[PDB]
Amino acid sequence: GSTMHFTDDNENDTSETMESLIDKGKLDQVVYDDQLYHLKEKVDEDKKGKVIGAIGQTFFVDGDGKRWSEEELKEPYISNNPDEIREKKPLRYGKVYSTNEDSDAKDEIIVEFNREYYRAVLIKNEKE
Known part of the structure; x- marks a missing residue:
C-alpha cells in the first residue's frame, strides 16, 4: 500500500502597513513593498x-x-x-537601500530612520 497527496502555494506576507506597526509600538520593524523587516543595527x-x-x-x-x-x-x-x-515623539522615515551582498538572497536591506541608516532583515522569511 502507499499514499498520494499534493500541495499548492500562495504568497504569505505580513499584509500590514507602517501605521499598523507604530499603532502597536513596533518601532524596531518597518513595512515596505508589502513586507516586514526587523531592525538589528545601525550602519x-x-x-x-x-x-x-x-x-x-x-x-x-x-x-x-x-x-x-x-x-x-x-x-x-x-x-x-x-x-x-502630552508629549509628541516625531518618527521620520528614510529612503531604503540594499546590503552589499551581490547575491539573489535579498533577505536583508537597509532602512533609514531619524536620518540614520540601519540594517534590517526579512521577518516573514523566518519563523522566529
Whole structure:
C-alpha cells in the first residue's frame, strides 16, 4: 500500500502597513513593498550597495506609544494647562537601500530612520 497527496502555494506576507506597526509600538520593524523587516543595527552610508525604495513617511506618538491623530496635531502647542498636554515623539522615515551582498538572497536591506541608516532583515522569511 502507499499514499498520494499534493500541495499548492500562495504568497504569505505580513499584509500590514507602517501605521499598523507604530499603532502597536513596533518601532524596531518597518513595512515596505508589502513586507516586514526587523531592525538589528545601525550602519554607515558606505555599507549600502544601491537604493531600492524609499519610505519617506513621518508619524508621531506620545509617551504611551499612541498614534497622534491629525485633529490632535492641528491644536496649538502653547496653551494654559501644561499638565493636560502630552508629549509628541516625531518618527521620520528614510529612503531604503540594499546590503552589499551581490547575491539573489535579498533577505536583508537597509532602512533609514531619524536620518540614520540601519540594517534590517526579512521577518516573514523566518519563523522566529
